[PDB]
Design a protein around this ligand. Structure first.
Ligand SMILES: COc1ccc(-c2c(-c3cc(Cl)c(O)cc3O)noc2NC(=O)C2CC2)cc1
Length: 207
């Protein structure tokens, strides 16, 4: 297991998300579904010139899986997946500029719900989760597990859990007071409100 420090700017963003009073927490789900849709768009596009990129799975979809026993909400997609370089360095480099812009917008009067317009919507996960685990598999790279409970660091390891084929699984370990996001009615409501027109099937599993 390798442990890394977040860039200072991203640590600051996570602290702001964790510490700011903001009731409209449900937007985290829209942001994660958006990221899934983006990843699905990318593998679909690449498959047009290299059909073999779908050898790891032709179905392009999103599953939402609540588990009350484990207090987790899991979002699974069969998108392009992230590489080790994506997880450790490259997405963070991109996130730095987006974070700076988002921070400045907030001081200017924007609200946390606009986070996705700056490309850093993933971090809204910390509105509802005490720990986030991201399991991901890109073609021709290994399956990795990224994890962070904030506090300025994250870890990356090669995942020896069940093989995914291709795509990303975001496991939200929910805060004790955020279990409403395990309820079927609540998840359905949020998907209908914010993710109505996503161009891939979204299947809400039931417990
Ligand atoms: C908004 O920024 C990004 C959005 C998605 C990704 C991504 C993902 C991905 C990332 C997150 Cl956090 C997620 O909840 C779901 C995802 O499927 N898997 O491959 C990617 N690789 C990509 O290149 C995606 C096309 C952009 C990476 C960055």
């Amino acid at each position: 297991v390798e442990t890394f420090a977040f860039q200072a700017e991203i640590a600051q963003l996570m602290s702001l998300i964790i510490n700011t009073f903001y009731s409209n927490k449900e937007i985290f789900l829209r942001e994660l579904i958006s990221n899934s849709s983006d990843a699905l768009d990318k593998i679909r596009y690449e498959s047009l010139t290299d059909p073999s990129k779908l050898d790891s799975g032709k179905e392009l979809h999103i599953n939402l899986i609540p588990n009350k026993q484990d207090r987790t909400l899991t979002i699974v997609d069969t998108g392009i997946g992230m590489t080790k370089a994506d997880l450790i360095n490259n997405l963070g480099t991109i996130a730095k500029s987006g974070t700076k812009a988002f921070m400045e917008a907030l001081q200017a009067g924007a609200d946390i719900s606009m986070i996705g317009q700056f490309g850093v919507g993933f971090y809204s996960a910390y509105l509802v989760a005490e720990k986030v685990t991201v399991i991901t598999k890109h073609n021709d790279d290994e399956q990795y597990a990224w994890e962070s409970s904030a506090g300025g660091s994250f870890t990356v390891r090669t995942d020896t859990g069940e093989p995914m084929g291709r795509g990303t699984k975001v496991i939200l370990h929910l805060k004790e007071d955020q279990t409403e996001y395990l309820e079927e009615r609540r998840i359905k409501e949020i998907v209908k409100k914010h993710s109505q027109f996503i161009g891939y099937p979204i299947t809400l599993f039931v417990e």
